Design an enzyme around this catalytic site. Structure first.
Site: not given
Ligand code: HCI
Ligand code: HCI
Lengths: 396, 396
Positions: B211, B246, B130
């Site tokens: 993460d 999310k 990312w």
């Protein structure tokens, strides 16, 4: 990796809530962190805020990411509040606003943006000072120097000492100013002093940074921005870190703004791109709820008038607690003239307590002020005033 | 001071929101930022979330500042979701959680914490990664190194290469893992591989950082936490930067958590003090609204059953799009086998599209993908599938 991490100095203000909560003395009183309280000693949600939130409940259809700079109408309303509706800064598009998590977030964003993209190496802050200024700016690798501000004999702004203190400050140094309600002294420059300071800053090539957390608490919305607007009339460049925590009693939704101003649109737009990069490496984009409330209120005539009156009610209640505070001290046996407290603006009273006196108020009376001797007048009510003034008198 | 600041694009991925928005072609398709859309191609607020906001509107009495580490119940619910209800980490009081503005805010907080309080010099991130991992850690002054991860030939973990490339990770280096739904590849370790990785890091003396932004989007809430818990079972020390953006479709309310784990309670409390110091130096305290929503939902039985079903519906819809996507790629005459996409976890397919193919998709078809070739499967509908598939077929 964690066994040898050394413990920190507790924060002189933030650390106060835990110490207060843990104290077992019945009748303990919290005059610490600067949150407005009502007559009942509560910190309520504003009715205009409740109205805006109900509106958002009914009408919001998504939680999709905001832009890195937040809600555009929020930035637009912020700029009017700060600079005045028909401002030449707005007509020339010389200002860009990032919605941030609090004026705190705006301060850190400013500090990272400056450290990464400019030749700025120091920021000058006032003593007495707000502790987080030095903390935030040092963390971004910036050196922090104090200028002189306060005459402690007269409880006055010591204007010559301020200027002499800053003889030091070079072109491309940042000088930090509190827009109104200087935290902690409550003493603000007059308009004329603001104009002299503005002119000196231009001539010295300082980059002004306004910390503007109390708009509406000194005299009112427009008059509180006079200092900032006087700097704005003179300067090609400045930064404003503003907050809606206090004027909307929206503390915990973290609603603030970092406003960048530069000589023209081209420049500010280009420099703002690197401000967005500083936010990218931090919290990425700002929280929608609190800012949507503020934009909803500021955009609707009728809501705004409801909020404006709530704000003046807050301000008038604090003025009443300050009269009652200096009256009750006298009645509780303080010799001293304390009239200087009446003319301090904002939420606080500042005189000259030592750390020793503060600690004694705490251990002996359960009255919690900040280590600097700063007291939250806005946390005072007709019911805690007597015991709190008795505590103060006993430690003088 | 601002005139020499150089034009840039901040966040490449968030930058796609603007590129997409500014495009005037009516048949444009957005496959960039990882935001879930429903069948109608909208990003609705969840029902559970609306119900919680409704409760909050009706019952909140204050916006008084949260503590630096946010809502205690939020912290509790987080660690249970992270570690499981019976976990020895919880019973032994070894974990402290700060509520942060996003998992992005949690990564920043973690990085400042390490930079400032430990001798951590470098962070190892997967290849590919990312993009914000590197810029976040670099911004805090930490070297970032890459470990081998994706076998772009087999669309598989190149596990042996991963272990080889980590050979030079030293005791006290951070190794960053994604908890599930690796971004961008969609390839996660198996439980056995997670277990091998947990053994190795203990052996090698690494500080694991997770993460964890996609809990529930691979297989399910508890299944997705297995890798983390295999690490938790072995490690003295650990950091988790988790997100609710999310799984609650709450992107813009900035709801995440930074969890710190140490060997015992005294150690984790003393280090968490310094984590609080890193937050104080930053945004000071986190936004209440979003995290309240999450705490409201997780601690009420009926409300959370509604939420889990909604999350199930999100995951199930994405999988249906993956299948529809490969099938219609085929039907449109695709000149590569895309069945490997079925095996990817999360919202994306890392499809092997080059930068050239990505730019031609954008320029010829108004289909916007991430420059790495990552496409948002969660943004696909039955209505946009055929046009987006003809676009990809034409550029292959
Ligand atoms: O007490 C104050 O000075 C105002 C409230 C505050 C305190 C510390 C950080 C942010 C805001
Ligand atoms: O598209 C993604 O990778 C997830 C969404 C996102 C993007 C950039 C910053 C934070 C979250």
């Amino acid at each position: 990796m964690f066994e040898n991490i050394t413990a920190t100095t507790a924060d002189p203000i933030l650390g106060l809530a835990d110490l207060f909560r843990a104290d077992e003395r019945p009748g303990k009183i919290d005059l610490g962190i600067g949150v407005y309280k009502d007559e009942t000693g509560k910190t309520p949600v504003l009715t205009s805020v409740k109205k805006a939130e109900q509106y958002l409940l009914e009408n919001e259809t998504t939680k999709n990411y905001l832009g890195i700079d937040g809600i555009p109408e929020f930035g637009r309303c912020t700029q009017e509040l700060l600079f005045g509706k028909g401002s030449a800064l707005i007509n020339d598009k010389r200002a860009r606003t990032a919605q941030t998590p609090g004026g705190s977030g705006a301060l850190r964003v400013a500090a990272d943006f400056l450290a990464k993209n400019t030749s700025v190496k120091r920021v000058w802050v006032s003593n007495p000072s707000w502790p987080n200024h030095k903390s935030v700016f040092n963390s971004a690798g910036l050196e922090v120097r104090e200028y002189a501000y306060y005459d402690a004999e007269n409880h006055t702004l010591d204007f010559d000492a301020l200027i002499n203190s800053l003889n030091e400050a070079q072109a491309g140094d940042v000088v930090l100013f509190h827009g109104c309600c200087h935290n902690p002294t409550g003493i603000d420059p007059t308009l004329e002093q603001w104009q002299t300071l503005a002119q000196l800053s231009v001539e010295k090539g300082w980059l002004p940074l306004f910390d503007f957390a109390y708009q509406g608490f000194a005299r009112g919305l427009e008059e509180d921005a006079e200092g900032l607007r006087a700097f704005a009339a003179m300067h090609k460049e400045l930064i404003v870190a503003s907050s809606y925590s206090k004027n909307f009693a929206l503390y915990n939704e973290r609603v603030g703004a970092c406003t960048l101003v530069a000589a023209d649109s081209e420049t500010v737009d280009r420099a703002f791109g690197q401000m967005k990069a500083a936010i990218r490496d931090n919290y990425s984009s700002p929280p929608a709820h609190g800012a949507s409330v503020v934009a909803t209120i500021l955009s609707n005539d009728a809501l705004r008038a409801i909020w404006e009156q709530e704000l003046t009610d807050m301000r008038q209640r604090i003025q009443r607690m300050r009269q009652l505070f200096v009256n009750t001290l006298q009645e509780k046996g303080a010799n001293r003239d304390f009239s200087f407290i009446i003319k301090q603006n904002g939420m606080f009273s500042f005189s000259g307590l030592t750390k020793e006196q503060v600690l004694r108020l705490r251990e002996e009376f359960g009255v919690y002020a900040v280590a600097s001797g700063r007291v939250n007048v806005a946390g005072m009510t007709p019911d805690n005033m007597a015991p709190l003034c008795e505590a103060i008198v006993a430690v003088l």
